[PDB]
Design an enzyme around this catalytic site. Structure first.
Site, PDB file in Angstrom:
ATOM      1  CE1 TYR E  26      38.725  29.641  47.648  1.00  0.00           C
ATOM      2  CE2 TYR E  26      39.902  31.720  47.532  1.00  0.00           C
ATOM      3  CZ  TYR E  26      39.021  30.879  48.185  1.00  0.00           C
ATOM      4  OH  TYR E  26      38.448  31.269  49.359  1.00  0.00           O
ATOM      5  CG  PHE E  36      43.362  38.602  49.787  1.00  0.00           C
ATOM      6  CD1 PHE E  36      42.070  38.162  50.017  1.00  0.00           C
ATOM      7  CD2 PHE E  36      43.770  38.816  48.484  1.00  0.00           C
ATOM      8  CE1 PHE E  36      41.206  37.931  48.961  1.00  0.00           C
ATOM      9  CE2 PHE E  36      42.907  38.582  47.429  1.00  0.00           C
ATOM     10  CZ  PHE E  36      41.626  38.142  47.670  1.00  0.00           C
ATOM     11  CG  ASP E  37      40.971  33.491  51.066  1.00  0.00           C
ATOM     12  OD1 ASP E  37      41.435  32.461  51.583  1.00  0.00           O
ATOM     13  OD2 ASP E  37      39.753  33.706  50.942  1.00  0.00           O
ATOM     14  CB  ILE E  56      32.870  38.418  43.675  1.00  0.00           C
ATOM     15  CG1 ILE E  56      34.080  37.500  43.526  1.00  0.00           C
ATOM     16  CG2 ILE E  56      32.844  39.076  45.041  1.00  0.00           C
ATOM     17  CD1 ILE E  56      35.387  38.243  43.478  1.00  0.00           C
ATOM     18  CE1 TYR E  82      33.821  41.417  48.694  1.00  0.00           C
ATOM     19  CE2 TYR E  82      36.027  41.067  47.847  1.00  0.00           C
ATOM     20  CZ  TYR E  82      34.925  40.601  48.536  1.00  0.00           C
ATOM     21  OH  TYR E  82      34.927  39.342  49.060  1.00  0.00           O
ATOM     22  CG  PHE E  99      40.885  35.140  42.437  1.00  0.00           C
ATOM     23  CD1 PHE E  99      40.916  34.797  43.774  1.00  0.00           C
ATOM     24  CD2 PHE E  99      40.120  36.225  42.044  1.00  0.00           C
ATOM     25  CE1 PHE E  99      40.191  35.521  44.704  1.00  0.00           C
ATOM     26  CE2 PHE E  99      39.396  36.948  42.977  1.00  0.00           C
ATOM     27  CZ  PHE E  99      39.435  36.596  44.304  1.00  0.00           C
TER      28      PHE E  99
END
Ligand SMILES: [Ca+2]
Lengths: 685, 48, 83, 48, 107, 290, 178
Positions: E26, E36-37, E56, E82, E99
């Site tokens: 992912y 960010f990831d 999540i 979040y 995502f």
């Protein structure tokens, strides 16, 4: 734009270098949560690419190397280094196979071979930014280590090989920028114990191929920084040699003790079939072993019951150990190489960096003096049965965790962590079975350091520490003396701020001298007058804390008075008997300051004890005079009772009165004059 | 006002003073017993 | 008062280490100070020689302005050697 | 991986290797001179 | 309340079932295109199990509707990822996440 | 010196200098100070010793006297027209001593500058001791309070024209110069001294609230940097609003590495880290990415 | 050596002890060059830390104490002058500066000219001697009544007399020449 364009844009280069510095600062000294957070701003691929890149400017190269080290390796390296000065050797089959030399002979290679000293492992967790959020501590972010070590070795080899080309475009713009970062990385990896036998063999080969075999770095021209890095590298191998010596000594000690016990058994069995020969078996074991080793000289070879073969074996081992330390009885050893290198560096030029000078001369001193280091290190050696390995490792983890919090400002998380760690330690059996081992690690010193650092602002931290210290004292007399050593330091603190609800430093101070005639006699007189001075204040001003809560104001604070009086009582009376020296000293000091006796005994305008206690009883009825968890009448009645009990304990024994000692009679007369008999009778009634 | 004190004030500027003989000529002459003179506070410039 | 052959092995090992250190290690004599000063006093091939540099370093540390003198073992060891 | 097809103008369409608009790697439809397609979006002016 | 868009087709016959573990690659980014990831940077696929509250809600609901070998895009609202707290130092409060998930293997 | 015991007597009255008897009430209160008086007989312990003083302390005392007088005059002059707009006519009060103040500030700034980083080690150590002594001497007499009052009184005006509306255009040309010189002198007094820096632990807002002023921004930043890098006491007082004000400085004044240095100074001091500051900086700076 | 002694600021410890040992070792036999170099350095720097530290060190020296002796006896039933060697080293070092009839150092020890303040070392030496004499007198008064003496009393007497013998030699060295 391409990051390599920063070689001509100086302002942006400076700003980015300072940005890297800020990143490296916000995660310093074990802040693992921020370290985990930073992984989303600088990922693995970026760091590895920057490590490989050859066109990067020097400042950014160094910044990225330092950033990698800070994010991923700093905490583990610090923790490992903190425990590298102790030697806990378990008795196991592989321990028995350690010898000083391979089959006096040629030295082995440093750092290779098997070791058995206990060292707790490392812990890491993988970063991930999709896990559900929920207070356990966080571990450091993980990163593959074998690939990293292979990369570091390859890079160092390439640098060394290309150093001989004397090219005009070194990586990073200079030799320093080319060499310092990789040396820092390899040193950090090496201290952590990530390398194997082959890797350390390669490193030694590329340091000096001629000496370590069965052009190097030292033969090149280097600036000061590279020399400092080389000194840091050589320290590690020196430490490894010292550890090897200690382990060999422990193995030989076990093997020798076996034979000694067998021989003593046989001799005792024989004896049953001069009377002076029977003194050996009715003496403490320490004396027995001491006398069994008194044959170093032939003149001292008269009282040893031993045979000749055992003595020859011990002599052979001693000679081998001396040979290993370089004591005689084209360099070809670590010591000669180090000495020659240091001297040559010193006499080649006038070095300017003080840190390099200190490092070189420390190394030289370590080399020239062989067994001084062994003597200084032996005190921190210990042996353990294999069944206790798990408990010892669990204890070491907690001890290291406590040590880590010696360099951070206190906060709620730190408080909780320390409380939990102390609770865990106090539940371990090894804490009871091996008190000498605990005293050898200096846990109490660490606990007191933490206690003082927050000295209230942390009431639960002081209570736990005081309880732990009191329990530590209660174990044995040696611990009692160890804590007695810091009595003056303990007294200086907690002189106005009581934090009365829970155990304080005065409590441990008192616990350090309970029922010990020797320690009580050794008590200094400077500790007695300071406490009396503290007491004098309690008889003059009320406690600000009570005033803040709205209590009525009176010109004294009985609580501190009773605390100090309790300490004095514990100091003066031991196991049902009164020590006269401290009694005389304390009574003299008290009479020197009549205000300490409290308002009733003030003298001029002072009412008797009976009237004071009656007034206190009547006060206890009125809520207005007793308060706005604590009451005033009871406090006053406790203060006076404690004072009277102290004075009573200070009186001398009757056998001294029979001898008609002048001092005893003077003391008794003074005490009798201080308190009327009818007052006591009235109080009792 | 004037006081007697000890401690750090022994190294501070508020404990220093200058001697001013009444005669102007040869004011640097060696001090001698019984000589009349003034006393001055350096920082505040006031006279005892 | 128990016989030495009844104690656990590890306690006996610790006692043996203590006794061996007390009796056999520190009693040994080894003189190296003269050789160490002679080696440091030479020069190759005027700039200071190594002993001069060491003395200058200690002087520099002494002259630094500080409230208290920190205790360091290196100075004590080298002072003992020189003495 | 990146792949696009479309038309472009003689003037203005001059992609240079390396950096540029947003994060680099610009292809067909990252400015107001070309018009591209990649199976799911229509690209023009660096907007999908 | 999750939007799902398809990028590449999958087998269309195998779907996640209770008691299985999903292995995916992912890439995450904010609504403004700020990454960010990404699991591909670490070169290690991410494994998680359904029903044990390990990720999540948005991710689990998005993955539950994907077939083996399918590549799709997911969008999660702030109330599902979040909320008003976010991830300190990574995601700000009240942020929408996007995502790029690909399902590799099921077990 | 140090050997000749002497007695002090008043010529006109013949009274001897001695000390009054201690007061039990004062002694119980801890008042060590013993008042001194003149008495007919006194005691037998009235002898005094004479101790020599160096040239530097005397020079410092004279400078303190002069500068205190001048700055008190300046402050009173400023207070003269606090709320009296001059309209179209002359300004209020006698004139200000502008030139004297400027010259005095310039002289004092050069009197406190630090030793060159190219001096031999031992001569430099001698240079650092004297400077610390002089800083303490000046601080003990209340010069910091005087400069703070001057800045406070000058700081109530937003720009040169707003000042000229009261003091007249003739003296408004030196406003910015005087402000800058005052900030520079404050930085010079504070730099490198732990005791002086520790004083700001109670009025840090006084410093942070001025960071956004358009005139003398660099001077205020320098003062803040000097304070932060020396006193661990201040590090334990910081709060989130101060951090946000500083981060406000980089999004308002541009990309300057001095601000990054200041932020780095808020995390670790003397090998001890403060978790709260690290957490606040990370939360308020990184996640946005602008 | 001089710089380290000045830096100690009159605090007992291992550092000052080792420094005094090194000074003794390098100054043995009344070496004249060393004395000249030390005097020149001291007069050149005009620093007052050296003699202040020496004065503090002398004031910190210990003497005999009866209370400690009685406490130790009581404890053994179930220290005193523990730093004598340091005192001997200090006074030997002071003596070696004047050895050989060096008038310059003999005068300098009494008054320092260029320095802002001055300290007299002869007064300090006599003060310490007086304290030691009083302690010895107290010890004899304690022991007068009984006849025999055990080991501890003899050892304490021997060491106190050794320190006294060193102080007397130092005082003699201060004077001769004359
Ligand atoms: Ca003689």
């Amino acid at each position: 734009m391409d990051i390599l364009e920063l070689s001509e844009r100086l302002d942006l280069q400076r700003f980015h270098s300072h940005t890297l510095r800020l990143y490296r600062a916000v995660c310093a000294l074990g802040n693992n949560r921020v370290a985990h957070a930073l992984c989303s701003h600088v990922d693995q691929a970026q760091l590895l690419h920057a490590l490989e890149d050859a066109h990067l400017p020097g400042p950014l190269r160094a910044g990225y190397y330092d950033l990698l080290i800070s994010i991923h390796l700093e905490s583990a390296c610090r923790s490992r280094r903190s425990m590298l000065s102790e030697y806990i050797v378990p008795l196991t089959p592989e321990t028995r196979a350690i010898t000083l030399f391979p089959p006096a002979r040629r030295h082995g290679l440093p750092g290779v071979g098997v070791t058995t000293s206990l060292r707790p492992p490392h812990h890491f967790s993988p970063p991930c930014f999709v896990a559900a959020l929920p207070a356990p501590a966080r571990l450091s972010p993980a990163i593959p280590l074998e690939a990293l070590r292979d990369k570091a070795l390859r890079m160092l080899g390439e640098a060394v090989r290309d150093g001989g080309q004397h090219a005009r475009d070194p990586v990073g713009g200079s030799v320093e920028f080319q060499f310092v970062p990789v040396l820092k990385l390899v040193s950090t990896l090496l201290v952590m114990g990530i390398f194997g036998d082959e890797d350390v063999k390669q490193i030694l080969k590329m340091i000096e191929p001629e000496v370590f075999t069965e052009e190097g770095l030292l033969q090149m021209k280097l600036p000061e920084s590279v020399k400092l890095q080389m000194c840091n590298l050589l320290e590690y191998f020196c430490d490894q040699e010292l550890q090897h010596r200690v382990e060999s000594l422990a193995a030989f000690a076990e093997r020798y003790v076996d034979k000694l016990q067998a021989n003593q058994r046989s001799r005792y069995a024989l004896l049953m079939r001069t009377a002076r020969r029977t003194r050996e078996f009715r003496s403490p074991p320490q004396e027995q072993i001491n006398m069994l080793l008194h044959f170093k000289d032939e003149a001292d070879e008269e009282d040893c019951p031993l045979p000749e073969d055992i003595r020859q074996d011990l002599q052979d081992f001693h000679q081998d150990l001396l040979a290993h330390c370089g004591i005689q009885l084209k360099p070809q050893s670590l010591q000669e190489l180090v000495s020659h290198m240091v001297v040559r560096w010193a006499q080649e030029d006038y070095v300017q960096s003080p840190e390099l000078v200190r490092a070189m001369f420390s190394l030289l001193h370590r080399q020239y003096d062989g067994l001084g280091e062994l003597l200084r290190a032996l005190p921190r050696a210990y042996t353990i049965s294999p069944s206790s390995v798990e408990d010892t490792m669990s204890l070491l983890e907690c001890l290291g965790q406590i040590r880590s919090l010696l360099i951070v400002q206190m906060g709620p998380q730190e408080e909780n962590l320390m409380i939990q760690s102390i609770g865990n330690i106090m539940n371990n059996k090894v804490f009871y079975q091996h008190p000498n081992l605990m005293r050898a690690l200096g846990m109490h010193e660490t606990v007191m350091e933490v206690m003082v650092n927050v000295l209230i602002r942390f009431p639960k931290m002081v209570t736990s520490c005081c309880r732990f210290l009191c329990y530590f004292c209660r174990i044995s007399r040696q611990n009692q003396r160890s804590m007695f050593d810091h009595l003056s330091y303990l007294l200086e603190n907690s002189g106005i701020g009581l934090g009365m609800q829970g155990s304080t430093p005065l409590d441990v101070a008192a616990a350090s001298v309970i029922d010990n005639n020797e320690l009580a006699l050794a008590l200094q007189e400077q500790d007695l007058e300071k406490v009396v001075s503290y007491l004098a204040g309690c008889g003059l001003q009320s406690c600000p804390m009570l005033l803040a809560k709205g209590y009525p104001d009176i010109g004294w604070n009985p609580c501190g008075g009773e605390r100090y009086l309790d300490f004095l009582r514990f100091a003066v009376f031991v196991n049902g008997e009164s020590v006269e020296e401290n009694a005389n000293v304390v009574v003299r000091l008290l009479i020197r300051k009549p205000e300490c006796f409290g308002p009733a005994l003030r003298g001029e305008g002072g009412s008797g004890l009976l009237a004071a206690i009656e007034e206190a009883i009547r006060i206890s009825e009125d809520p207005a005079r007793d308060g706005p968890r604590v009451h005033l009448g009871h406090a006053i009645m406790s203060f006076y009772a404690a004072l009277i009990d102290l004075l009573g304990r200070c009186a001398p024994e009757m056998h001294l009165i029979q001898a008609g000692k002048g001092e005893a009679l003077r003391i008794r007369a003074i005490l009798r004059s201080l308190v009327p008999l009818d007052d006591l009778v009235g109080i009792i009634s | 006002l004037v006081y007697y004190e000890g401690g750090a004030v022994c190294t501070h500027a508020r404990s220093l003073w200058r001697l001013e003989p009444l005669r102007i000529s040869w004011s640097g002459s060696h001090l001698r017993w019984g000589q009349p003179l003034r006393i001055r506070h350096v920082t505040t410039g006031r006279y005892l | 008062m128990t016989p030495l052959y009844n104690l656990p092995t590890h306690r006996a090992c610790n006692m043996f280490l203590e006794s061996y250190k007390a009796a056999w290690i520190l009693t040994e004599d080894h003189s190296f100070e003269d050789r160490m000063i002679d080696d440091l006093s030479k020069a190759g091939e005027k700039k200071p020689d190594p002993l001069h540099q060491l003395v200058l370093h200690f002087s520099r540390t002494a002259l630094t302005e500080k409230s208290k003198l920190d205790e360091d073992y290196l100075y004590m060891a080298y002072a003992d050697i020189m003495a | 991986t990146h792949l696009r097809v479309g038309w472009a103008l003689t003037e203005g369409y001059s992609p240079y290797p390396g950096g540029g608009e947003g994060w680099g790697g610009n292809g067909v439809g990252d400015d107001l001179y070309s018009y591209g397609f990649d199976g799911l979006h229509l690209w023009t002016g660096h907007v999908a | 309340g999750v939007e799902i868009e398809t990028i590449s087709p999958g087998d269309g016959r195998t779907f996640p079932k209770k008691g299985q573990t999903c292995v995916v690659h992912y890439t995450g980014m904010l609504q403004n295109g700020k990454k960010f990831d990404s699991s591909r940077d670490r070169n290690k696929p991410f494994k998680f199990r359904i029903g044990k509250q390990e990720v999540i809600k948005g991710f689990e609901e998005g993955a539950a509707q994907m077939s083996l070998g399918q590549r799709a895009k997911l969008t999660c609202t702030p109330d599902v990822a979040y909320g008003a707290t976010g991830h300190p130092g990574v995601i700000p409060p009240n942020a929408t996440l996007i995502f790029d998930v690909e399902l590799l293997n099921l077990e | 010196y140090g050997e000749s015991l002497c007695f002090v007597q008043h010529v006109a009255s013949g009274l001897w200098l001695t000390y009054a008897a201690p007061d039990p009430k004062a002694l119980r209160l801890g008042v060590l100070k013993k008042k001194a008086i003149l008495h007919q007989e006194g005691h037998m312990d009235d002898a005094l010793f004479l101790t020599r003083c160096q040239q530097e302390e005397s020079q410092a005392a004279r400078m303190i006297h002069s500068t205190a007088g001048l700055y008190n005059q300046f402050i009173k002059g400023l207070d003269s027209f606090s709320g009296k707009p001059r309209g179209s006519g002359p300004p209020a009060g006698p004139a200000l001593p502008i030139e004297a103040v400027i010259l005095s500030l310039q002289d004092l700034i050069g009197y406190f500058e630090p030793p060159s980083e190219e001096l031999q080690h031992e001569e430099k150590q001698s240079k650092l001791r004297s400077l610390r002594n002089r800083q303490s001497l000046f601080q003990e007499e209340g010069m910091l309070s005087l400069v703070l009052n001057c800045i406070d009184r000058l700081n109530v005006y937003t720009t040169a024209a707003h000042f000229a509306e009261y003091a007249g255009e003739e003296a408004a040309e030196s406003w910015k110069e005087i402000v800058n010189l005052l900030y520079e002198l404050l930085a010079s007094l504070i730099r490198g001294n732990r005791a002086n820096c520790a004083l700001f632990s109670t009025n840090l807002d006084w410093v942070v609230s001025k960071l956004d002023r358009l005139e003398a921004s660099s001077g205020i930043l320098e003062v803040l940097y000097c304070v932060l890098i020396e006193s661990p006491e201040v590090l334990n007082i910081i709060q989130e609003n101060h951090i946000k004000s500083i981060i406000s400085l980089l999004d308002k004044h541009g990309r300057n590495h001095k601000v990054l240095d200041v932020l780095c100074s808020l995390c670790v001091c003397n090998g001890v880290a403060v978790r709260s500051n690290q957490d606040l900086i990370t939360e308020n700076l990184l996640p946005g990415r602008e | 050596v001089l710089q380290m002694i000045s830096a100690c600021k009159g605090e007992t410890g291992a550092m000052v002890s080792s420094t005094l040992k090194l000074g003794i070792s390098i100054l043995n036999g009344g070496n004249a060059e060393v004395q000249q170099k030390m005097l020149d350095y001291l007069k050149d720097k005009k620093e007052v830390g050296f003699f202040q530290s020496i004065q503090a060190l002398m004031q910190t020296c210990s003497v005999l104490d009866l209370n400690a002796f009685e406490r130790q006896n009581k404890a053994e039933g179930l220290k005193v002058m523990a730093d004598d060697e340091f005192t001997q080293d200090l006074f030997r070092f002071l003596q070696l500066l004047c050895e050989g009839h060096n008038n310059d150092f003999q005068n300098y020890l009494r008054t320092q000219t260029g320095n802002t303040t001055t300290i007299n070392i002869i007064i300090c030496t006599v003060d310490y001697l007086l304290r030691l004499q009083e302690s010895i007198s107290d010890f004899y008064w304690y022991y007068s009544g009984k006849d025999v003496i055990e080991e501890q009393g003899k050892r304490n007497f021997s060491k106190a007399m050794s320190v006294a013998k060193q102080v007397f030699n130092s005082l003699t060295e201060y004077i001769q020449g004359p």
